[PDB]
Design a protein around this ligand. Sequence first.
Ligand SMILES: CCCCCCCCCCCCOS(=O)(=O)O
Ligand SMILES: CCCCCCCCCCCCOS(=O)(=O)O
Lengths: 157, 157
Amino acid sequence: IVTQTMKGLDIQKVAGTWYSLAMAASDISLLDAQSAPLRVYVEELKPTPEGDLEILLQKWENGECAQKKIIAEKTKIPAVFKIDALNENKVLVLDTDYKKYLLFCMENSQSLACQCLVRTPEVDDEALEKFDKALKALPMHIRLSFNPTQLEEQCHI
Amino acid sequence: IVTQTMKGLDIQKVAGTWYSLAMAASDISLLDAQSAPLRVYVEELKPTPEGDLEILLQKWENGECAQKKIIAEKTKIPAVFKIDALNENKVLVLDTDYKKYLLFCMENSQSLACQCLVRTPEVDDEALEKFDKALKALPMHIRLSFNPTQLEEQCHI
Ligand SMILES: CCCCCCCCCCCCOS(=O)(=O)O
Ligand SMILES: CCCCCCCCCCCCOS(=O)(=O)O
């Protein structure tokens, strides 16, 4: 569904701390519940030398904030990764400047969620504008955004 | 907080069937849960001859879809009503053309939710555009929108 990918992505340069400033999804149920399936809070990106992407995130599960470690494997397209789990869901990097923001989407094989990641716990209106522009023609039906207090809390409490 | 109100509103002309096509709120928790406090689905508006506004709506409460009947009392401002309940929360009519869409907000005394109401169970992109433009500088952190199937179901299941 997503036909915006970043050209010339250097995955080594997305390494490090990120904050999930905003998220949106195609179906309300994907982000609705506190333990909704795609309601995940990115902590850190850890590219491997081989160009795979290790992802640390938090997820509300079974009544508490849980730590998760995800491996997204590289594909022939630099901006597209495949998560090794049941149905191989794709991670697509739409746009980044490495030092401030990164926009990405995840999709199955039809559900879709996207996020605006930022480097610091601040509301970046410019990054949010790029996020909303990118989402403009994607079929989203839920959108969440977080304040600086929430961004410094586990699972954005 | 809301400083957009409709000039020349004729409340008699908003009477009848409406659909809650989209909703947004200042705090995620106001719309997050299925039984969230401001997650309400408008059914019908029934102005009184005296210019008060009877509101029929559905709300998820105690595990099921419940019917509610609300009276919003008129004030000296044609576009502003006061709901007779605990803390007198204000209903503000931002914009309408009567025959297609109506944009309104509800606020306490600081929480805020707004909706885009439409006359028919169809996605009205133009009405949604006006909704988003109106919300642009309001401090919203959650937004939901519904599809035509959902609009024809109780509590938008
Ligand atoms: C540039 C990449 C940005 C991060 C990609 C995030 C992928 C998250 C997938 C979580 C799936 C659900 O997570 S799970 O732990 O519950 O299974
Ligand atoms: C032009 C006016 C548009 C409709 C106004 C809707 C006001 C809804 C307030 C519900 C409060 C919560 O509802 S309650 O039944 O749980 O108490």
